[PDB]
Ligand binder design. Structure first.
Ligand SMILES: C[As](C)(=O)[O-]
Ligand SMILES: [Zn+2]
Ligand SMILES: [Zn+2]
Ligand SMILES: [Zn+2]
Ligand SMILES: [Zn+2]
Lengths: 331, 331
């Protein structure tokens, strides 16, 4: 593909560097940041926080993040462009659809959703000219008809553009298998797909079977381990009860099984969030003060201590995301 | 007190004139018009259609419309301002919440929703400085805890500002009675409330009892009818099988019952819609080519034919809306 679209324009593959492939500047809902910025203190305060957060990730080695905030998660690409410029960190914007499609979206056909995704990749997002460089989709539990529709639209937009697909799953129901079956029915190469939130499960058989088929495995919620918060049923029912080390050890397990080229690692962090309880951002920041720097500051050294060679870690953090993000109709 | 907030700024109540109190420029979902304007052909084409349509209504006597498109219906206050100025027709913008709140909205408390509505009334919508002049809310036949939350927030916003409330109801389920009960539980005078979509039911006992308590009765979907479109299931499901004359006769029925002062008449029209089936705008336009001018060009002469005095009609189309829309504080 030779070049990747970012919120500051196209960049060469060689410029991508250390990449976090599943992040958010702000997790919200369509139109919300514009309608009630004071929910986040102010837009200015959100930008300031995000710029500090990205600058800290940059100092820990990160050069690119993939912001997988979709339309229905309130993606504001102008926000992304501003914080990318100030922090000097590449940001890849997303199209696709998460779990909260509005009535307008829920009424659309597979053809119409394909056109929408293609618009955001080929023409630009809103009136900004910023083009999406990834397609993000989400399913939960048992595949609904609309979920299937979004997955087929995602596959078709990927096939038309070479841009990869990244998914939200909820590993407990092995949602990746359902997603894979739909993607393959559309003729999509598994090498264009990252099955994400895969660190939510300890089922290594499930993960290795997907990697064997050629899928990228997104181990992308490593710091979302709320092991001291049982009094907080909200944090418990959204973060879980396994430690971050246990999650991180899945990375090593997959490396040990021979699948280092299939692994993508990230934090799934953000600097503001409105789509859960008020001040849930404070709860998250309390559990993981490192923010997006958690992967480079904590997880990479942890894997290095466990015997993972430097070259393998560089492969996972630099080579795999570059190969994944580079638009490809092959192979 | 004697001035209403419009998308072009405050205007004296004496300038309001022939008013349609339940209308839309565009029915959509949050952020959608900005993300995929091509769904409507283009933003420019939507503006052209709306300005033309509004101009036709202006020529037929209409001076003001109340656009009760909310945040979740994809209200675009900049669209409203542009079309208001070009058609030279007053437009009152809405705050509140309809039936499609996103995840962020669904997670908010009664206090938070109150603050949101108050922002849009007291400060302005988004970063435009354009203030809302009506609070629009909606519940289903069987009201949820979230619906009740929205109604209480609406009542508290109305009490703090004097701006009135308009509701969407399932009139067939006598929705006004459950809404009125919580409105009154918050101390809100009924004269601040229009129970909308009341022409959906022919239960005159229901309508007259609400009218008798001092509620406004929105007979606001008069041209909506799928008569002669029985092979179109989506048309039938939304527009219904009752004739426009049937709906219009409810206006004369309430007049004859002595409640001409409680009647607000409108079209519930729009010039674009994305929150239903594709091209449904074409279906609506084929049913009512007159658009927002249907009420002056078809309904008013119909009622005259049926013996309704001109004076009664002038009072319904001009005096009632002025009294309703004018901000009223105490009691
Ligand atoms: C916005 As999420 C918690 O599904 O990565
Ligand atoms: Zn996710
Ligand atoms: Zn995420
Ligand atoms: Zn309605
Ligand atoms: Zn309406």
């Amino acid at each position: 593909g030779d070049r990747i679209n970012t919120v500051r324009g196209p960049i060469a593959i060689s410029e991508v560097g250390f990449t976090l492939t599943h992040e958010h500047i702000c997790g919200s809902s369509a139109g919300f940041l514009r309608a009630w910025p004071e929910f986040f203190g102010s837009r200015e305060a959100l930008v300031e926080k995000a710029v500090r957060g990205l600058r800290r990730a940059r100092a820990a080695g990160v050069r690119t993040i993939v912001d997988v905030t979709t339309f229905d998660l309130g993606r504001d690409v102008r926000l992304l462009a501003e914080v990318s410029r100030a922090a000097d960190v590449h940001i890849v914007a997303a199209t696709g659809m998460w779990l909260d499609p509005s009535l307008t979206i829920r009424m659309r056909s597979v053809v119409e959703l394909t056109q929408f995704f293609l618009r955001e990749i080929q023409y630009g997002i809103e009136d900004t000219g910023i083009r999406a460089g990834i397609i993000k989709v989400a399913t939960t539990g048992k595949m609904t008809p609309f979920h299937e529709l979004v997955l087929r639209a995602a596959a078709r937009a990927s096939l038309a553009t070479g841009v990869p697909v990244i998914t939200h799953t909820e590993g407990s129901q092995r949602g990746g298998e359902q997603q894979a079956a739909i993607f393959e029915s559309e003729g999509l190469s598994p090498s264009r797909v990252c099955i994400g939130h895969s660190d939510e499960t300890d089922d290594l058989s499930y993960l290795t079977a997907l990697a064997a088929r050629g899928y990228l495995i997104g181990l992308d919620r490593i710091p979302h381990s709320a092991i001291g918060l049982e009094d907080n049923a909200s944090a418990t029912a959204l973060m879980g009860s396994r430690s971050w080390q246990t999650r991180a050890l899945l990375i090593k397990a997959l490396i040990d099984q021979g699948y280092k080229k299939q692994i993508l690692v990230s934090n799934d962090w953000l600097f503001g969030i409105s789509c859960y309880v008020t001040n849930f951002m404070d709860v998250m920041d309390s559990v993981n003060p490192d923010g997006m720097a958690f992967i480079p500051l904590r997880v990479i050294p942890f894997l290095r201590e466990k015997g993972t060679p430097q070259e393998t870690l560089a492969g996972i953090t630099v080579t795999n995301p570059a190969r994944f993000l580079s638009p490809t109709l092959r192979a």
